Coordinates of C-alpha atoms and ligand atoms in Angstrom, one line a residue:
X1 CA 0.0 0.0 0.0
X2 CA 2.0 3.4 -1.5
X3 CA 1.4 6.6 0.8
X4 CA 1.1 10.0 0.0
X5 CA 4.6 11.1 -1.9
X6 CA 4.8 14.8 -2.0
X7 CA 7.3 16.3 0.4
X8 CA 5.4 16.6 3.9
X9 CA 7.7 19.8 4.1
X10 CA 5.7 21.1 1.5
X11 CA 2.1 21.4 3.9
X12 CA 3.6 21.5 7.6
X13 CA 6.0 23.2 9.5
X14 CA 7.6 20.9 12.4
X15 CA 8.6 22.7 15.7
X16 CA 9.2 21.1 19.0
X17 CA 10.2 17.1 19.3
X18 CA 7.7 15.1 21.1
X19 CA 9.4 11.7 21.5
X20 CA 12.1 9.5 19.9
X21 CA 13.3 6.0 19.4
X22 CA 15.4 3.6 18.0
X23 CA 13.6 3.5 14.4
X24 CA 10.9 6.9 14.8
X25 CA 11.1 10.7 15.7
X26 CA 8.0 12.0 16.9
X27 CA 7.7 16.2 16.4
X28 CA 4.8 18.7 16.6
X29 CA 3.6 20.0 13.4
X30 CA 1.2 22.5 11.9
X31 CA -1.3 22.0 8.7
X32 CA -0.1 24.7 6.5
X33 CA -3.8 24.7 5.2
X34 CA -5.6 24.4 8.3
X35 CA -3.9 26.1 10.7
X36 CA -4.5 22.5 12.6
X37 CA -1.5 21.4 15.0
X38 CA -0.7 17.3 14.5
X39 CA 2.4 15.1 15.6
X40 CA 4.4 13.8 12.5
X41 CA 5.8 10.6 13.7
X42 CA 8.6 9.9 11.1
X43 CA 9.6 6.3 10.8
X44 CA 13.0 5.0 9.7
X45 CA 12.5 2.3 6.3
X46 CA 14.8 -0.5 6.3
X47 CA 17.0 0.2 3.1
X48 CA 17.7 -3.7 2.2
X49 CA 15.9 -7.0 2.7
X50 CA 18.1 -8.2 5.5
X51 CA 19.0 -5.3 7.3
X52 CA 18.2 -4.8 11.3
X53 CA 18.1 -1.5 10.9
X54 CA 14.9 0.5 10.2
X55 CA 10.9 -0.9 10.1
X56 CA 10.0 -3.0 7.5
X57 CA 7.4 -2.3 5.3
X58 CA 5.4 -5.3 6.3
X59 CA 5.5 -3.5 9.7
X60 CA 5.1 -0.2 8.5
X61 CA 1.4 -1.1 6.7
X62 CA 0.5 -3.0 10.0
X63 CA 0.6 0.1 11.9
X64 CA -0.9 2.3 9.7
X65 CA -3.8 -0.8 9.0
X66 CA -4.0 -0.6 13.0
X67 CA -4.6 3.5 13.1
X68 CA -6.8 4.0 10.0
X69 CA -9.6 1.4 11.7
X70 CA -9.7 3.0 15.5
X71 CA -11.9 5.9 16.4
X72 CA -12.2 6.3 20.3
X73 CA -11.6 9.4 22.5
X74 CA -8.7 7.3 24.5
X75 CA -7.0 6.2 21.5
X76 CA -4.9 8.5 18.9
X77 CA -6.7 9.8 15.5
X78 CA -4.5 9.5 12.5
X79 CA -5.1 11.7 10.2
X80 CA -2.8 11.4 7.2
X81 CA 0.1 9.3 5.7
X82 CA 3.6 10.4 3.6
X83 CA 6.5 8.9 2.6
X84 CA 9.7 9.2 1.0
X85 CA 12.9 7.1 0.6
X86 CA 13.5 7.1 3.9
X87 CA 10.9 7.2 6.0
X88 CA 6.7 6.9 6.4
X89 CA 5.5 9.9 8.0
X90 CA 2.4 9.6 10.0
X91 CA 0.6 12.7 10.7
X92 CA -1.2 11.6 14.1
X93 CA -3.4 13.4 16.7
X94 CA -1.5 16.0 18.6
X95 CA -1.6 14.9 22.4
X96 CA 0.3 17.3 24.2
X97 CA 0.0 17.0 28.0
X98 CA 2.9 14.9 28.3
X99 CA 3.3 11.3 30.2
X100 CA 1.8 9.1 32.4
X101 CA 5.0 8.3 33.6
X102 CA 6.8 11.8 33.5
X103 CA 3.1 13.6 35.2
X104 CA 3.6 10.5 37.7
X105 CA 7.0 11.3 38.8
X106 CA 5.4 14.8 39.7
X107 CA 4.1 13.0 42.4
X108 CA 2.1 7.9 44.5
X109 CA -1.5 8.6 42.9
X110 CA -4.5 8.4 45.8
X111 CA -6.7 5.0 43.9
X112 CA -9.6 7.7 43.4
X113 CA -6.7 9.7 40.9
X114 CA -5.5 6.2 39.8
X115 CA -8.8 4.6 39.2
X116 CA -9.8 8.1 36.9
X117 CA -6.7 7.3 34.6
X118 CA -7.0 3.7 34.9
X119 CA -10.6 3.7 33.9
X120 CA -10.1 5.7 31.0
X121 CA -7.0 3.0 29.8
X122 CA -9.4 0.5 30.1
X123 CA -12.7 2.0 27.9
X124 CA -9.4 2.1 25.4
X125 CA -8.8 -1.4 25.5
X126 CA -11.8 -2.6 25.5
X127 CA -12.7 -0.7 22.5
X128 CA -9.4 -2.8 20.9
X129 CA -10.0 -5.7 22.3
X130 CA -13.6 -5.3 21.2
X131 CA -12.2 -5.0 17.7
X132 CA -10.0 -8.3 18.3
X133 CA -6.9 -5.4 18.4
X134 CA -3.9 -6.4 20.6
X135 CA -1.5 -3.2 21.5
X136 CA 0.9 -5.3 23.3
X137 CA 2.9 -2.3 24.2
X138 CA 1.1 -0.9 27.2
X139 CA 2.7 1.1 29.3
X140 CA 3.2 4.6 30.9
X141 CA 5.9 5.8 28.1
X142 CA 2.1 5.0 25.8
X143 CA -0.1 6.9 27.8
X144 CA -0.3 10.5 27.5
X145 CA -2.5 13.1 28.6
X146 CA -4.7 15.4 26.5
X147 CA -4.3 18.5 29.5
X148 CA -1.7 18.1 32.8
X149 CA -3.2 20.8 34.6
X150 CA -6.6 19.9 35.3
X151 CA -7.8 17.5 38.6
X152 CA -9.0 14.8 36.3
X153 CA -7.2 14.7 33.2
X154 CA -8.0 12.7 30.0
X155 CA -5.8 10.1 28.3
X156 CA -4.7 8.7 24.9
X157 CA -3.2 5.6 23.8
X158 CA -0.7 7.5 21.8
X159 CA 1.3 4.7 19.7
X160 CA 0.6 1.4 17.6
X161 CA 3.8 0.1 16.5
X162 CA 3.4 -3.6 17.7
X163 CA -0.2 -3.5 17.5
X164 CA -1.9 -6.7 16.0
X165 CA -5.1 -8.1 14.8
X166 CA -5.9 -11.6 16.4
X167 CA -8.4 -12.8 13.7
X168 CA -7.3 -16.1 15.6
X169 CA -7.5 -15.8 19.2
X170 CA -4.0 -15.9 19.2
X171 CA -0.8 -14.8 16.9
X172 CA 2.6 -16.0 17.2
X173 CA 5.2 -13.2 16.4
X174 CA 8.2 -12.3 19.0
X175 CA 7.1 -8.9 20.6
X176 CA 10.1 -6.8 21.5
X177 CA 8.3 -5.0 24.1
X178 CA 9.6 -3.7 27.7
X179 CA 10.3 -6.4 29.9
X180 CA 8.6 -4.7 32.9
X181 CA 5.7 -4.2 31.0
X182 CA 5.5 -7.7 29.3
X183 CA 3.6 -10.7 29.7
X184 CA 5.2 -14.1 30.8
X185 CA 4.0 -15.5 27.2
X186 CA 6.0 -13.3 25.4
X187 CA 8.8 -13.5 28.1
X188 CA 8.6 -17.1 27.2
X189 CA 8.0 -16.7 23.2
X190 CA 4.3 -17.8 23.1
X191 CA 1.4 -17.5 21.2
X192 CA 0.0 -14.4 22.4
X193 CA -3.5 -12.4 22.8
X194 CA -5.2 -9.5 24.1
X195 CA -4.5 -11.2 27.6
X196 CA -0.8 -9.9 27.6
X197 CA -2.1 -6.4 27.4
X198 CA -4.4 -7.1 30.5
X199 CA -1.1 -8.4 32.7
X200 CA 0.3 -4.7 31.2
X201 CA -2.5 -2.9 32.6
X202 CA -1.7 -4.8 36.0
X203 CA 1.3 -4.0 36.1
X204 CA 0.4 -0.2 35.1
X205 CA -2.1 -0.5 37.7
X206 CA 0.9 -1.7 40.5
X207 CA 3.2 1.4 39.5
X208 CA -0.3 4.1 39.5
X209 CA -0.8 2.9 43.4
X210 CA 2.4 2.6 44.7
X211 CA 5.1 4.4 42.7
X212 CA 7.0 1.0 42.2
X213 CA 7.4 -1.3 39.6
X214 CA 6.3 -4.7 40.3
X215 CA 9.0 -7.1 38.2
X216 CA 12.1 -4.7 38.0
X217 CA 15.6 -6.2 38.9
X218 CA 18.7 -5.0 38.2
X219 CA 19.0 -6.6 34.5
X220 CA 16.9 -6.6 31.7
X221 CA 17.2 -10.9 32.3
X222 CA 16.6 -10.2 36.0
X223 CA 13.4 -8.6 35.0
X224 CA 12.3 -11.2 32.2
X225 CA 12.9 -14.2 35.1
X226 CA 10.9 -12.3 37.7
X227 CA 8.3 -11.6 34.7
X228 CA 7.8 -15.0 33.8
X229 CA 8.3 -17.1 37.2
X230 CA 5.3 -14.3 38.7
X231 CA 8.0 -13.0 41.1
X232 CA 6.1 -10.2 42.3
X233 CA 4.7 -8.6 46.3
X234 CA 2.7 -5.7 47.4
X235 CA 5.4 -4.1 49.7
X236 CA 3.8 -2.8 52.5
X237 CA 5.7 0.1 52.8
X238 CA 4.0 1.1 49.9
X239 CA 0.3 -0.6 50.2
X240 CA -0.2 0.0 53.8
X241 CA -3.2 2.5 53.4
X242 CA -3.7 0.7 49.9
X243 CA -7.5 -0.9 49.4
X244 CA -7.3 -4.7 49.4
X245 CA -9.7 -4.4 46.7
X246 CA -7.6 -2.5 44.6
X247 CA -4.6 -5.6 45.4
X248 CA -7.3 -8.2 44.7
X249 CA -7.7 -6.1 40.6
X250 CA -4.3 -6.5 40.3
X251 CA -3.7 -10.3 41.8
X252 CA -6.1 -11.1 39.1
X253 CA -4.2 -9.8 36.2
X254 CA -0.7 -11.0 36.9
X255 CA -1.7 -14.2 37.1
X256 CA 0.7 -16.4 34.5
X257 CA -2.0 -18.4 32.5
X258 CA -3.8 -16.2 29.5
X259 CA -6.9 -18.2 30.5
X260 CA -7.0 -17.4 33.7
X261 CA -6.5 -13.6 33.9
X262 CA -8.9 -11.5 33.9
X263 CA -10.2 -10.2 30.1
X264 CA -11.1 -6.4 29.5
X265 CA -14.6 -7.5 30.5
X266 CA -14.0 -8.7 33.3
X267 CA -11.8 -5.5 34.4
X268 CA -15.0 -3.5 34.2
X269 CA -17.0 -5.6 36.3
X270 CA -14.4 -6.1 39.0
X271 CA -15.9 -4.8 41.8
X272 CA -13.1 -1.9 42.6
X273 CA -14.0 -0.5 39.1
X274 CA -17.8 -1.5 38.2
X275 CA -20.1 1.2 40.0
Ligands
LIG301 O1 7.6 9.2 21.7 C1 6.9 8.6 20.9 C2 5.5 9.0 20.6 C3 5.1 10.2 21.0 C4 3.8 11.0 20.8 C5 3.5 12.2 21.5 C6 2.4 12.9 21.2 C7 1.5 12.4 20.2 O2 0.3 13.1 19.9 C8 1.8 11.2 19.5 C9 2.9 10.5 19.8 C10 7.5 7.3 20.2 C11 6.6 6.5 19.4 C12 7.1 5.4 18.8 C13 8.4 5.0 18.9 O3 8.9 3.8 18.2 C14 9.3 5.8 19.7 C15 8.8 6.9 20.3 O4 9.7 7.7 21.1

């Protein structure tokens, strides 16, 4: 599928960088023709067959596939798509209220503040899931927020790029996620589902109430062991005044069988989110 091959220079101006990778650049940008501000993620095309470096375009069409199906207030619009030589240019919904993760290290959330973010990262899943969409990259570095300065502010999904559609219940593909953000399946190179992203909304949901991340070691391999052998505990230094309800919504999603843990449903009716 070709993209739009005019020079993206040509109708917006970039200003200020947004986020950056390995493989993509994320900057702000303005519609020339609209006035309308947007974030141009530019992502870098592998250059040969073989190569390491770079998406491929198999890849490439996935995400963009992924972005041009999902309409939902807690999930990022796109709006239009470029390339060149070098890279695939989306022009995606502007989110500017910065991280999850950087607005958390502002402050432990009280669950009332966690459960507002929380519930919103769960109407976005389930519209996903509902769609048979796997993101299987949840985590706070994904979550950004559409104003920081109000009490209660609104959230977006904000990136796609090892997001899947699991016509099969399953898919099996390596996911080169975050190890202490993934699921013991893809730890352990299995097939995998929308049940890995409910373990990642556990472990979100550890981190929100406690400022602590639940699998972390020292290594990236220390991490993956503790992810897949469930090595977790709710550190009462840091869950003393925290609901036992609100450990019981997390004990049920980092649980190590797919089957077992808790689906997007399920989340909703849990009785420390259903009202
Ligand atoms: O940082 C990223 C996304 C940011 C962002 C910010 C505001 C938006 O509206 C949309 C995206 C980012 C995305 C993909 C990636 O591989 C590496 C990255 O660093």
């Amino acid at each position: 599928t070709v993209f739009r091959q005019e020079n993206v220079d040509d109708y917006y101006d970039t200003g200020e960088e947004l986020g950056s990778g390995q493989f993509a650049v994320v900057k702000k940008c303005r519609e020339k023709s609209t006035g309308l501000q947007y974030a141009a993620k530019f992502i870098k095309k592998r250059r040969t067959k073989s190569s390491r470096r770079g998406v491929s375009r198999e890849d490439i069409e996935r995400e963009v596939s992924i972005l041009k199906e999902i309409q939902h207030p807690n999930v990022i619009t796109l709006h239009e798509v470029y390339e060149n030589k070098t890279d695939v240019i989306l022009i995606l919904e502007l989110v500017a209220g910065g991280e999850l993760f950087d607005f958390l290290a502002e402050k432990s959330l009280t669950e009332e503040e966690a459960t507002e973010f929380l519930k919103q990262i769960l109407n976005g899943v389930y519209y996903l899931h509902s769609l048979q969409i796997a993101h299987f990259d949840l985590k706070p570095e994904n979550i950004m927020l559409l104003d920081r300065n109000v009490p209660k502010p609104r959230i977006k999904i904000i990136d796609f790029g090892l997001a899947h559609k699991i016509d099969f219940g399953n898919e099996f593909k390596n996911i080169f996620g975050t190890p202490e953000f993934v699921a013991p399946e893809i730890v352990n190179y299995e097939p995998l589902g929308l049940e890995a992203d409910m373990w990642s909304i556990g472990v979100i949901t550890y981190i929100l109430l406690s400022g602590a991340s639940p699998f972390l070691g020292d290594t990236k391999q220390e991490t993956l062991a503790n992810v897949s052998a469930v090595n977790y505990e709710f550190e009462d230094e840091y869950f003393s005044n925290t609901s036992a309800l609100a450990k019981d919504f997390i004990r049920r999603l980092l649980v190590k069988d797919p089957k077992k843990r808790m689906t997007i449903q399920d989340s909703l009716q849990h009785p420390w989110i259903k009202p």
